[PDB]
């Protein structure tokens, strides 16, 4: 990604917001892979240390190695909007030129946290 955060050393606990619904991959999980949707992502170290990230797309390749892989475009902490309110209204109102650009930019703001 534009940033690189996680090594592949130790098994950890992570949740994923998939297109088949928000799931959870722990330990020797089945190589279940499908595209993720722009939403919140919860990551927790051992003993319950609270962390968080964000995802704007990509898959989550899993192999019987007890280690999860995740790729996206955005990967920052949650701590890191009047212009978006106009960009949201400007997306709601689109003419005959392909609207598709309008709807997609609002599905990433559905998290809003």
């Amino acid at each position: 990604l534009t940033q690189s955060i996680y090594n592949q050393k130790e098994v950890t606990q992570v949740n994923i917001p998939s297109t088949a619904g928000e799931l959870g991959i722990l330990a020797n999980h089945v190589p279940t892979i499908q595209q993720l949707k722009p939403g919140v992502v919860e990551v927790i170290e051992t003993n319950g240390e609270t962390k968080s990230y964000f995802i704007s797309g990509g898959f989550a390749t899993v192999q019987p190695d007890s280690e999860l892989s995740v790729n996206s475009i955005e990967a920052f902490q949650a701590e890191d909007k009047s212009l978006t309110a106009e960009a949201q209204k400007n997306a709601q109102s689109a003419d005959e030129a392909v609207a598709a650009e309008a709807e997609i930019e609002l599905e990433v703001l559905e998290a809003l946290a």
């Binding site: 088949a20 619904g21 928000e22 799931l23």
Partner: protein, 76 residues
């Protein structure tokens, strides 16, 4: 009226076989409620008011079957 009472009791037990549709039914509703929330959890408060809707509609069907069964015992 010996055959009358005997008919009131066999048909009443046959009127309880219609409770299978409600027994399987309510399960299928809550099956999708679990298998739907387990996917997208943010739709919890939404699908829960819709799992409580299909339940009362399927439970009322078994109520119709239980109505006939309770009518043959105490009425006509």
């Amino acid at each position: 009226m010996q055959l009358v009472l005997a008919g009131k009791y066999i048909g009443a037990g046959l009127a309880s076989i219609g409770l299978v549709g409600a027994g399987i039914g309510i399960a299928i509703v809550f099956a999708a409620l679990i298998n739907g929330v387990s996917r997208n959890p943010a739709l919890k408060g939404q699908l829960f008011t819709y799992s409580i809707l299909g339940f009362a509609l399927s439970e009322a069907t078994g109520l119709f079957a239980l109505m006939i069964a309770f009518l043959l015992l105490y009425a006509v």
